[PDB]
Structure 1
Amino acid sequence: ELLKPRTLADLIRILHELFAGDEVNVEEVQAVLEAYESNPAEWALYAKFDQYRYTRNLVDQGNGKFNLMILCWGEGHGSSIHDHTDSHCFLKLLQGNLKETLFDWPDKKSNEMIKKSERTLRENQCAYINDSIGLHRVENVSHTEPAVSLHLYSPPFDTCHAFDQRTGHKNKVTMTFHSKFGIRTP
């Protein structure tokens, strides 16, 4: 039974229930993420920005079933084109807007990766990606508004691949957390 999360803490409690089993009902998880109305006071602890690039700030470890984290995107900050290591990946906007660009898995032949589509993700909207859908890049293209997003990955993963847009070539990358549970972790 899916109820509206009243607060971020409530959302977390609901997620623990939804991930208590061995599978994941994606539509249910997306619906609950979308239903949480971003309240900046509740996540200010985690919203730690860096001048030069976006930051990943761990919020909850899901009793081992998922990682929930907050990403903070300065003006003009964006990601690489990347995959999600055979995991579910949900993204919900807490502040600002992000541009998501979708790409196909490259062929073994060296070629320009062409975008399959783009969309603008707006405050409170929750998107979903997985490797069967394709790859993506996420970017804050704003010149005037920082963005903040809430991401859930299940199972948790700390490595993925970045793809070169000009060739499709992939390189393994290890993601790092800027902070964990509100504490900066250099």
Structure 2
Amino acid sequence: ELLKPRTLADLIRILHELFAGDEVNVEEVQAVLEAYESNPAEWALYAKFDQYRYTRNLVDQGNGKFNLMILCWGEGHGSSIHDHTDSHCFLKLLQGNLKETLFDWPDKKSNEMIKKSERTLRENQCAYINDSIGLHRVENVSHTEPAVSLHLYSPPFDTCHAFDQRTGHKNKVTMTFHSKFGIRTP
């Protein structure tokens, strides 16, 4: 029985129930994430920016079956084109806007990866990606406004691949947490 999360803490409680089982109802999880109304005071602890690139800040370790984290994107900060390592990946905007560009999995032949589409994710919207949908790049194209997003992955993963837009060639990247539970982890 999906109810509106009153706060980030409440959202976290609800996610624990939604992942209590072995499977994931994606539309339910997306609906719940979207229904949470971003309250900057509730997530200020996790919103740790870096001047040069976006940061990943662990919020909740889940129950074995998922991770929840907050990503902070300075003006002009973006990601590589990348996958999500056979996991569900939900992205909800907490502040500002991000541009998401979608790409197809490349062919083994070296070739330019051409975008299949792009959209602007706006405050409070929750997007979903998984490998069956494709690859994406996410960027804060704003010149004046930082962005903050809330990400949920299941199962958790700490490696992914970055793709070279010119060739489609991939390289494994190990993902790191800038902070965990509000504590900077260098």
For Structure 1 versus Structure 2, the TM-score category normalised by the shorter chain is over 0.9
SS at 1:176's partner residue? coil
Displacement of 1:19:
0.0
- CA drift of 1:144 comes to 0.1
Deviations 1:70-127 (A, max 9, x none): 0000000000000000000000000000000000000000000000000000000000
Question: Normalization by structure 1: what TM-score?
Answer: 1.00
- 1:99 is paired with a residue of what secondary structure? strand
How many angstroms apart in 1 are the aligned matches of 2:31 and 2:64? Answer: 22
3-state SS of paired residue (2:44): helix
| Percentage of identical aligned residues | 100
What secondary structure sits across from 1:62 in the alignment?
Answer: coil
Deviations 1:14-35 (A, max 9, x none): 0000000000000000000000
Structure 2: gaps of 5 or more residues: none
Q: C-alpha distance in 2, partners of 1:185/1:66?
A: 20
In 2, Cα distance between equivalents of 1:181 and 1:66: 15
Residue 185 of structure 1 and its aligned partner are, at CA, apart by 0.1
What is the CA–CA distance in structure 1 between the aligned matches of 2:64 and 2:158, rounded to whole Å?
A: 13
Instruction: Give secondary structure in 1 for the equivalent of 2:13.
Output: helix
| Structure 1 unmatched ranges of 5 or more | none
What displacement does 1:63 show? 1.3
CA distance, structure 2, for counterparts of residue 142 and residue 64 of structure 1: 36
TM-score (norm: length of structure 2): 1.00
Flag as ranges the 4+ runs of structure 1 deviating above 2 A.
none
Which residue of the partner structure matches residue 59 of structure 1?
59
- Which digits, 9 at most, give the CA deviation of each residue in 1:50-72, with x for residues without a partner? 00000000000111110100000
Does residue 175 of the first structure (1) align with residue 175 of the second (2)? yes
CA distance in 1, matches of 2:64, 2:185: 20
How many residue pairs match? The answer is: 186
For residue 163 of structure 1, what is the aligned residue in structure 2? 163
Shift of 1:42: 0.1
Question: 2:64 and 2:117 mapped to 1: Cα distance?
Answer: 33
Instruction: Give 1:89's aligned residue.
Output: 89
Question: Could you tell me how far apart the structure 1 residues matched to 2:10 and 2:52 are?
Answer: 33
